[PDB]
Design an enzyme around this catalytic site. Structure first.
Site, mmCIF file in Angstrom:
data_model
loop_
_atom_site.group_PDB
_atom_site.id
_atom_site.type_symbol
_atom_site.label_atom_id
_atom_site.label_comp_id
_atom_site.label_asym_id
_atom_site.label_seq_id
_atom_site.Cartn_x
_atom_site.Cartn_y
_atom_site.Cartn_z
ATOM 1 N N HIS B 43 14.339 -37.494 34.327
ATOM 2 C CA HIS B 43 15.805 -36.612 35.090
ATOM 3 C C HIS B 43 15.440 -35.058 34.772
ATOM 4 O O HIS B 43 15.890 -33.631 35.178
ATOM 5 C CB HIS B 43 16.506 -37.284 34.965
ATOM 6 C CG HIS B 43 16.917 -37.298 32.899
ATOM 7 N ND1 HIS B 43 16.569 -37.324 32.377
ATOM 8 C CD2 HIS B 43 16.917 -36.221 32.625
ATOM 9 C CE1 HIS B 43 16.875 -37.290 30.737
ATOM 10 N NE2 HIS B 43 17.168 -36.066 31.398
ATOM 11 N N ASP B 99 13.097 -43.657 34.198
ATOM 12 C CA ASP B 99 12.936 -42.134 33.722
ATOM 13 C C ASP B 99 12.089 -41.935 33.382
ATOM 14 O O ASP B 99 11.811 -41.634 32.033
ATOM 15 C CB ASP B 99 14.944 -41.935 33.594
ATOM 16 C CG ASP B 99 15.038 -40.360 33.602
ATOM 17 O OD1 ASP B 99 14.332 -39.876 33.607
ATOM 18 O OD2 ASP B 99 15.388 -40.489 32.048
ATOM 19 N N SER B 197 16.856 -35.076 25.200
ATOM 20 C CA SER B 197 16.234 -35.371 26.739
ATOM 21 C C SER B 197 14.997 -35.434 26.826
ATOM 22 O O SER B 197 14.360 -34.420 26.792
ATOM 23 C CB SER B 197 16.897 -35.127 28.067
ATOM 24 O OG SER B 197 18.553 -35.190 27.101
#
Ligand code: NAG
Lengths: 27, 248
Positions: B43, B99, B197
């Site tokens: 992502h 992911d 992230s």
């Protein structure tokens, strides 16, 4: 061969300030 | 990172920062797994609802950094990317299943006191360490409050029981993710944030003293999860994809 052993910690027989918290959690 | 503390120098030598070239901006964390491979979240590179679809030439990485701002002369290293690989079954519209992404550096990075690879988990490490209550570690330069840190931040977070993980969100979770974070009860509320992230969730094996990357920090927006645990890509479950990409 060498992964996950930090030059300034494990390789010097030094421990970081909070790794105790991780190892003590492993019940 | 919210409610973490300052990392020590060389404490996370596999930490990688992913940047957009132009305009220059910190995008995501990432991790060094060899001299020319970096692991991050899919992502971080591909997210159509926000018109995000980066190619190799849009990006750079910085490795060996401690300070967010300061240039660390003869210590930090910059690299361009040769190739990006996104898991072909990455589900960006629903639940961010799988992911995970790999980035190959244009040139190998030299290892140093400040730059060193993390281990990929093996079966024994995955089976014995990935248990509810056991703590892993997240590091990053993501947001500080629900704003930005001067040096690398660290927090330790307990793995959460799967049924609790499922009840914490309305989207359909898969076995390819796990969730970590402190109970809405008393104690602490350290957490990873947006910006963190793509970075590593690491655990130290008491058996051999090595650090293993068990997870990849998945989706986050600011430092507010509404008290809910954050999700992590289960690296061991995706290990055969990683090997297929890196070998052959
Ligand atoms: C990303 O961009 C490339 C062209 O640069 C295109 O082939 C690909 O379909 C895009 N991915 C999307 C929209 O998911």
């Amino acid at each position: 061969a060498d992964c996950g052993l930090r030059p300034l910690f494990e390789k010097k027989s030094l421990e970081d300030k909070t790794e105790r918290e991780l190892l003590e959690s492993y019940i | 990172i919210v409610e973490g503390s300052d990392a020590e120098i060389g404490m996370s030598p596999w930490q990688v920062m992913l940047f957009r070239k132009s305009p220059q901006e910190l995008l995501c964390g990432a991790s060094l797994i060899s001299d020319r491979w970096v692991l991050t979240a899919a992502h971080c590179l591909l997210y159509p609802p926000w018109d995000k679809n980066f190619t190799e030439n849009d990006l750079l990485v910085r490795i060996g950094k401690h300070s967010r701002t300061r240039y660390e002369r003869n210590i930090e290293k910059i690299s361009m990317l040769e190739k990006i690989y996104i898991h072909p079954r990455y589900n960006w519209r629903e639940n961010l299943d799988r992911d995970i992404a790999l980035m190959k550096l244009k040139k190998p990075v030299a290892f140093s006191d400040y730059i060193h690879p993390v281990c990929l988990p093996d079966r024994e490490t995955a089976a014995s360490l990935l248990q509810a209550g056991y703590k892993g570690r997240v590091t990053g330069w993501g947001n500080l409050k629900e704003g930005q840190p001067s040096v690398l931040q660290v927090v330790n977070l307990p793995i959460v029981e799967r049924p609790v993980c499922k009840d914490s969100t309305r989207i359909r979770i898969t076995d390819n993710m796990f969730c970590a974070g402190y109970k809405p009860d008393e104690g602490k509320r350290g957490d990873a944030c947006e910006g963190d992230s793509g970075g590593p969730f690491v655990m130290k094996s008491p058996f051999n003293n090595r650090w293993y990357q068990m997870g990849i920090v998945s989706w986050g927006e600011g430092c507010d999860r509404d008290g809910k645990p954050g999700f992590y890509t289960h690296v061991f479950r995706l290990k055969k994809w990683i090997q297929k990409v890196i070998d052959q």
